[PDB]
Design a protein around this ligand. Structure first.
Ligand code: FME
Ligand code: K
Ligand code: MG
Ligand code: MG
Ligand code: MG
Ligand code: MG
Ligand code: MG
Ligand code: MG
Ligand code: MG
Ligand code: MG
Ligand code: MG
Ligand code: MG
Ligand code: MG
Ligand code: MG
Ligand code: MG
Ligand code: MG
Ligand code: MG
Ligand code: MG
Ligand code: MG
Ligand code: MG
Ligand code: MG
Ligand code: MG
Ligand code: MG
Ligand code: MG
Ligand code: MG
Ligand code: MG
Ligand code: MG
Ligand code: MG
Ligand code: MG
Ligand code: MG
Ligand code: MG
Ligand code: MG
Ligand code: MG
Ligand code: MG
Ligand code: MG
Ligand code: MG
Ligand code: MG
Ligand code: MG
Ligand code: MG
Ligand code: MG
Ligand code: MG
Ligand code: MG
Ligand code: MG
Ligand code: MG
Ligand code: MG
Ligand code: MG
Ligand code: MG
Ligand code: MG
Ligand code: MG
Ligand code: MG
Ligand code: MG
Ligand code: MG
Ligand code: MG
Ligand code: MG
Ligand code: MG
Ligand code: MG
Ligand code: MG
Ligand code: MG
Ligand code: MG
Ligand code: MG
Ligand code: MG
Ligand code: MG
Ligand code: MG
Ligand code: MG
Ligand code: MG
Ligand code: MG
Ligand code: MG
Ligand code: MG
Ligand code: MG
Ligand code: MG
Ligand code: MG
Ligand code: MG
Ligand code: MG
Ligand code: MG
Ligand code: MG
Ligand code: MG
Ligand code: MG
Ligand code: MG
Ligand code: MG
Ligand code: MG
Ligand code: MG
Ligand code: MG
Ligand code: MG
Ligand code: MG
Ligand code: MG
Ligand code: MG
Ligand code: MG
Ligand code: MG
Ligand code: MG
Ligand code: MG
Ligand code: MG
Ligand code: MG
Ligand code: MG
Ligand code: MG
Ligand code: MG
Ligand code: MG
Ligand code: MG
Ligand code: MG
Ligand code: MG
Ligand code: MG
Ligand code: MG
Ligand code: MG
Ligand code: MG
Ligand code: MG
Ligand code: MG
Ligand code: MG
Ligand code: MG
Ligand code: MG
Ligand code: MG
Ligand code: MG
Ligand code: MG
Ligand code: MG
Ligand code: MG
Ligand code: MG
Ligand code: MG
Ligand code: MG
Ligand code: MG
Ligand code: MG
Ligand code: MG
Ligand code: MG
Ligand code: MG
Ligand code: MG
Ligand code: MG
Ligand code: MG
Ligand code: MG
Ligand code: MG
Ligand code: MG
Ligand code: MG
Ligand code: MG
Ligand code: MG
Ligand code: MG
Ligand code: MG
Ligand code: MG
Ligand code: MG
Ligand code: MG
Ligand code: MG
Ligand code: MG
Ligand code: MG
Ligand code: MG
Ligand code: MG
Ligand code: MG
Ligand code: MG
Ligand code: MG
Ligand code: MG
Ligand code: MG
Ligand code: MG
Ligand code: MG
Ligand code: MG
Ligand code: MG
Ligand code: MG
Ligand code: MG
Ligand code: MG
Ligand code: MG
Ligand code: MG
Ligand code: MG
Ligand code: MG
Ligand code: MG
Ligand code: MG
Ligand code: MG
Ligand code: MG
Ligand code: MG
Ligand code: MG
Ligand code: MG
Ligand code: MG
Ligand code: MG
Ligand code: MG
Ligand code: MG
Ligand code: MG
Ligand code: MG
Ligand code: MG
Ligand code: MG
Ligand code: MG
Ligand code: MG
Ligand code: MG
Ligand code: MG
Ligand code: MG
Ligand code: MG
Ligand code: MG
Ligand code: MG
Ligand code: MG
Ligand code: MG
Ligand code: MG
Ligand code: MG
Ligand code: MG
Ligand code: MG
Ligand code: MG
Ligand code: MG
Ligand code: MG
Ligand code: MG
Ligand code: MG
Ligand code: MG
Ligand code: MG
Ligand code: MG
Ligand code: MG
Ligand code: MG
Ligand code: MG
Ligand code: MG
Ligand code: MG
Ligand code: MG
Ligand code: MG
Ligand code: MG
Ligand code: MG
Ligand code: MG
Ligand code: MG
Ligand code: MG
Ligand code: MG
Ligand code: MG
Ligand code: MG
Ligand code: MG
Ligand code: MG
Ligand code: MG
Ligand code: MG
Ligand code: MG
Lengths: 64, 71, 51, 75
RNA sequence: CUUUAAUGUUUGAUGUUCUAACGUUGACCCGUAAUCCGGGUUGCGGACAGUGUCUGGUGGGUAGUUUGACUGGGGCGGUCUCCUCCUAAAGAGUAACGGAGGAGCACGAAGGUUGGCUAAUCCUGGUCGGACAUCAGGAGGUUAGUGCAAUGGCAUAAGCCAGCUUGACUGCGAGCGUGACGGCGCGAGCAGGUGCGAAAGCAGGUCAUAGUGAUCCGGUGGUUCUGAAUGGAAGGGCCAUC
RNA sequence: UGAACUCGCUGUGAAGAUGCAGUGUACCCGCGGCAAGACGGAAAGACCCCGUGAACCUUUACUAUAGCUUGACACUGAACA
RNA sequence: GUUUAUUAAAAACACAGCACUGUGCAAACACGAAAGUGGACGUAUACGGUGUGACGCCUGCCCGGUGCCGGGAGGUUAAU
RNA sequence: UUUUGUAUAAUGGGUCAGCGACUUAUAUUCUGUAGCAAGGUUAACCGAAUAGGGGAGCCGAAGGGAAACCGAGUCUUAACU
RNA sequence: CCAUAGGUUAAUGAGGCGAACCGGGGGAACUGAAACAUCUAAGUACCCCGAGGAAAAGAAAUCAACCGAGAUUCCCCCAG
């Protein structure tokens, strides 16, 4: 039988052109007033997954 | 249900007519794809009149430089 | 505890707002700061309001 | 025991030492108070972090009435 | 509108009687040689009781489970995240149930900026007034102060004082530090729009370092985004936020 | 019952040696006795700890639940006050 | 008298007697999806449960807590 | 064998003979190797047939964006050195 | 009161067994979630009823997307 994708991971990562994955930053859901604007601005755009935790992502979603 | 038609695989249908049902017979895009777009992937020779299809600004220069008139 | 948090809403423009903390017991009146609305792209009287 | 507590360490110190070529924006000294002070082409942020404001080589100087350490950059 | 009388009009808590559902482990009769069961007469209950669905309460009667780690064996006690100093061997880092302390905030002025200022503690003289309140001069010079621990720092004052104010601004961000990662932090300059100053300038909160929690789920406002035939909508998304 | 050509002592040594070092002593082999040692044999310690193991048992631990108990609708009908 | 057949025979269990308690007969209660059985072909001098444990002298104060029992005005309160 | 460490007086084995433990199926990424190449390639099936059809598909040659949408650009943003 | 329940006799089938496969009625737990209660294992094991040579399903109150498919079933894709 075929491999099943870890769907939760499929809803948190997207495959870029090279091979790496874009993901949304943590710490931008609630408790925002105490955080500085500079943080919240820097956390807004998407970000690339680090080379340490890339193998864990590549395993859990083998399709795309 | 939208495709990205390569302009390299443009003149492989029916002379110079590429509506949708004609393009579908050439096996370039899937069956359940109503909307589709011609991007600048390089290389056209023959004149192709691209009817009923969305075309890119780079491909609009190329297709017309080859000869064919869009819409 | 004690110090609650408030929603500074604009007057002239869209319902864009800021959020600050406020001590309600010591200062029972309302704020009326002049902060920047980025939808209208101009400084506007931002009035205090509840969440 | 009554105690058995400590904070995480802050990694404070001279990151770029004297003579080292640094790029415009490079942090030279992370510290608490102005032990070192900002000289020529060197800034001083809210955290008292001295950083390069120009591409050049770091220079440590000891000048002033109170004999303080200053950090300059010369291209 | 209040406040209330007679009649029509619309329903309800109660009950009390009724018999026809229902009950009958009252009595008899028949299938019938039978204390079963059915049927039939007949009394006594009688629309209650009982039984079905829904529903609140109760429920170790019964079932499935949970009941943390560190630990100079385990238990009891103590600790678990964040900040400061030493341990830490002159960069960074560095343990122990090693040695000492703090934090889970505070503030529309305690922020901004402009313009000023200088402290402690004594000495001597002076009404009530005395060691000490307020005044004068002299002495010392940062022992002071810094919204809170400790550290490093500050007279160019970051100290204490006033005058206007809202930069505790939106979009970014060259280039660095620090983390296994999640993350965290420092940041000149650009666009837009303010404040303060006569202008150079300074301003993306507070002298810095604690004041804090991921995801999921859901709420609240916004929105050139999506909308299961089409038009809307719901519901999602994106932005702000709880 | 790993194989044995299967001594004492003092030391050493995964920390109590038939087996290592140094030393001492001892012809080869039965038979009857004794049980100090072979950390002798017998049971993957039952004490203690550990496992995000098991089982039963307790309870005002969490969750349910049979049973018991309350109303609504149903089987369920006519008067009048 | 009974008890751990196979390491415990006892002070343990039972016991006659004693109290509280439920039960009005289609009894309480028990076994049982139910029909139905037992209780009992018994009917409160009976039956079930709980404790205590021949016999003699006795058995004191507390109803705040947990349970039980009664009361129904008031508050809160599900389905509908 | 397990260990920081075993002649260890820690584990296991009386001996011999036989048997006894990284497998199989489909998906997937990477390395080698062979085919053909901006192409490669078929699946069930139809063939009696390891031929040959059948390209339904799949994958690649284009990505950015949450998405509409635009596309050698595009996203961000009022606009980006 | 007729009648019904009954009770005889007679025709006519049924009864039981059997490896798997099929449809229905009931229906676990270990296990996984590195604990565990939603969830998983799984309508799986098992129990029961009716089958037949197959059984079930079946000729649209189907699903498409302004074009159109024209019953069910089974296999390969769409698509982890
Ligand atoms: C169950 S109590 C057992 C006593 C314990 N064990 C000895 O082997 C001693 O010490
Ligand atoms: K009431
Ligand atoms: Mg959000
Ligand atoms: Mg911050
Ligand atoms: Mg800010
Ligand atoms: Mg802030
Ligand atoms: Mg795929
Ligand atoms: Mg195709
Ligand atoms: Mg394709
Ligand atoms: Mg190309
Ligand atoms: Mg102690
Ligand atoms: Mg430290
Ligand atoms: Mg340390
Ligand atoms: Mg070099
Ligand atoms: Mg700064
Ligand atoms: Mg009747
Ligand atoms: Mg009767
Ligand atoms: Mg009757
Ligand atoms: Mg009866
Ligand atoms: Mg008779
Ligand atoms: Mg009878
Ligand atoms: Mg009868
Ligand atoms: Mg009832
Ligand atoms: Mg209920
Ligand atoms: Mg309940
Ligand atoms: Mg309950
Ligand atoms: Mg229990
Ligand atoms: Mg239990
Ligand atoms: Mg436990
Ligand atoms: Mg423990
Ligand atoms: Mg201990
Ligand atoms: Mg120890
Ligand atoms: Mg010890
Ligand atoms: Mg403890
Ligand atoms: Mg820690
Ligand atoms: Mg020191
Ligand atoms: Mg040190
Ligand atoms: Mg050091
Ligand atoms: Mg050193
Ligand atoms: Mg490190
Ligand atoms: Mg260490
Ligand atoms: Mg330590
Ligand atoms: Mg404390
Ligand atoms: Mg003001
Ligand atoms: Mg002030
Ligand atoms: Mg100020
Ligand atoms: Mg002035
Ligand atoms: Mg000043
Ligand atoms: Mg001081
Ligand atoms: Mg100090
Ligand atoms: Mg002041
Ligand atoms: Mg003032
Ligand atoms: Mg003015
Ligand atoms: Mg803007
Ligand atoms: Mg940046
Ligand atoms: Mg650049
Ligand atoms: Mg960069
Ligand atoms: Mg690192
Ligand atoms: Mg990072
Ligand atoms: Mg911080
Ligand atoms: Mg900070
Ligand atoms: Mg600047
Ligand atoms: Mg620049
Ligand atoms: Mg400007
Ligand atoms: Mg203007
Ligand atoms: Mg202007
Ligand atoms: Mg103005
Ligand atoms: Mg001016
Ligand atoms: Mg002037
Ligand atoms: Mg002017
Ligand atoms: Mg200016
Ligand atoms: Mg800036
Ligand atoms: Mg500032
Ligand atoms: Mg301050
Ligand atoms: Mg100030
Ligand atoms: Mg804070
Ligand atoms: Mg904290
Ligand atoms: Mg959750
Ligand atoms: Mg959760
Ligand atoms: Mg909603
Ligand atoms: Mg709107
Ligand atoms: Mg709208
Ligand atoms: Mg948009
Ligand atoms: Mg819209
Ligand atoms: Mg639309
Ligand atoms: Mg629609
Ligand atoms: Mg549809
Ligand atoms: Mg619809
Ligand atoms: Mg549909
Ligand atoms: Mg919605
Ligand atoms: Mg939404
Ligand atoms: Mg925005
Ligand atoms: Mg926007
Ligand atoms: Mg021998
Ligand atoms: Mg011998
Ligand atoms: Mg001998
Ligand atoms: Mg010896
Ligand atoms: Mg020794
Ligand atoms: Mg030995
Ligand atoms: Mg020895
Ligand atoms: Mg020797
Ligand atoms: Mg001998
Ligand atoms: Mg001999
Ligand atoms: Mg002899
Ligand atoms: Mg002998
Ligand atoms: Mg003997
Ligand atoms: Mg030996
Ligand atoms: Mg041993
Ligand atoms: Mg032994
Ligand atoms: Mg064992
Ligand atoms: Mg063992
Ligand atoms: Mg024990
Ligand atoms: Mg555990
Ligand atoms: Mg564990
Ligand atoms: Mg357990
Ligand atoms: Mg159990
Ligand atoms: Mg057992
Ligand atoms: Mg139990
Ligand atoms: Mg029961
Ligand atoms: Mg029962
Ligand atoms: Mg109703
Ligand atoms: Mg006996
Ligand atoms: Mg015995
Ligand atoms: Mg025994
Ligand atoms: Mg005896
Ligand atoms: Mg005995
Ligand atoms: Mg007795
Ligand atoms: Mg008596
Ligand atoms: Mg009593
Ligand atoms: Mg009685
Ligand atoms: Mg039962
Ligand atoms: Mg039954
Ligand atoms: Mg009964
Ligand atoms: Mg009976
Ligand atoms: Mg009898
Ligand atoms: Mg007794
Ligand atoms: Mg007595
Ligand atoms: Mg007793
Ligand atoms: Mg006597
Ligand atoms: Mg009394
Ligand atoms: Mg009482
Ligand atoms: Mg009372
Ligand atoms: Mg009552
Ligand atoms: Mg009561
Ligand atoms: Mg009552
Ligand atoms: Mg009542
Ligand atoms: Mg009442
Ligand atoms: Mg109500
Ligand atoms: Mg071992
Ligand atoms: Mg060991
Ligand atoms: Mg050995
Ligand atoms: Mg050795
Ligand atoms: Mg041994
Ligand atoms: Mg042993
Ligand atoms: Mg051994
Ligand atoms: Mg072993
Ligand atoms: Mg062992
Ligand atoms: Mg072994
Ligand atoms: Mg052995
Ligand atoms: Mg062998
Ligand atoms: Mg064999
Ligand atoms: Mg393998
Ligand atoms: Mg490759
Ligand atoms: Mg390769
Ligand atoms: Mg190769
Ligand atoms: Mg090759
Ligand atoms: Mg080639
Ligand atoms: Mg064939
Ligand atoms: Mg042929
Ligand atoms: Mg032939
Ligand atoms: Mg064949
Ligand atoms: Mg494809
Ligand atoms: Mg290319
Ligand atoms: Mg893409
Ligand atoms: Mg794309
Ligand atoms: Mg554009
Ligand atoms: Mg856009
Ligand atoms: Mg745009
Ligand atoms: Mg643009
Ligand atoms: Mg512009
Ligand atoms: Mg532009
Ligand atoms: Mg007759
Ligand atoms: Mg007759
Ligand atoms: Mg007849
Ligand atoms: Mg008959
Ligand atoms: Mg017969
Ligand atoms: Mg016959
Ligand atoms: Mg016959
Ligand atoms: Mg017959
Ligand atoms: Mg016959
Ligand atoms: Mg016949
Ligand atoms: Mg049969
Ligand atoms: Mg079946
Ligand atoms: Mg079956
Ligand atoms: Mg399993
Ligand atoms: Mg489990
Ligand atoms: Mg389970
Ligand atoms: Mg599990
Ligand atoms: Mg597990
Ligand atoms: Mg467990
Ligand atoms: Mg399933
Ligand atoms: Mg079923
Ligand atoms: Mg079944
Ligand atoms: Mg199974
Ligand atoms: Mg037949
Ligand atoms: Mg059939
Ligand atoms: Mg059929
Ligand atoms: Mg049917
Ligand atoms: Mg049919
Ligand atoms: Mg029909
Ligand atoms: Mg559609
Ligand atoms: Mg048809
Ligand atoms: Mg069909």
């Amino acid at each position: 039988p075929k491999i099943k994708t870890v769907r939760g991971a499929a809803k948190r990562f997207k495959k870029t052109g090279k091979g790496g994955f874009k993901h949304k930053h943590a710490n931008l859901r609630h408790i925002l007033t105490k955080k500085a604007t500079k943080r919240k601005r820097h956390l807004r755009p998407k970000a690339m997954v680090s080379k340490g935790d890339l193998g864990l992502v590549i395993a859990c979603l083998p399709y795309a | 249900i939208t495709a990205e038609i390569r302009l390299s695989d443009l003149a492989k249908v029916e002379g110079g007519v590429v509506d949708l049902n004609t393009l579908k017979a050439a096996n370039i895009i899937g069956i359940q794809i109503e909307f589709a777009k011609v991007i600048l992937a390089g290389e056209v020779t023959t004149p192709v009149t691209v009817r009923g299809l969305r075309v890119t600004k780079g491909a609009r220069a190329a297709i017309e430089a080859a000869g064919g008139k869009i819409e | 505890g004690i110090r609650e948090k408030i929603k500074l809403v604009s007057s002239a423009g869209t319902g864009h707002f800021y959020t600050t903390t406020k001590n309600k017991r010591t200062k029972p009146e309302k704020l009326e700061l002049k902060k920047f609305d980025p939808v209208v792209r101009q400084h506007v009287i931002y009035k205090e309001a509840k969440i | 025991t009554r105690n058995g507590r400590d904070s995480e360490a802050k990694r404070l110190g001279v990151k770029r030492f004297g003579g080292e070529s640094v790029l415009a924006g490079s942090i030279i000294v992370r510290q608490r108070g102005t032990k070192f002070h900002a000289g020529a082409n060197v800034g001083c942020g809210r955290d008292h972090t001295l950083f390069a404001k120009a591409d050049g080589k770091v220079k440590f100087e000891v000048k002033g009435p109170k004999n303080r350490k200053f950090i300059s950059i010369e291209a």
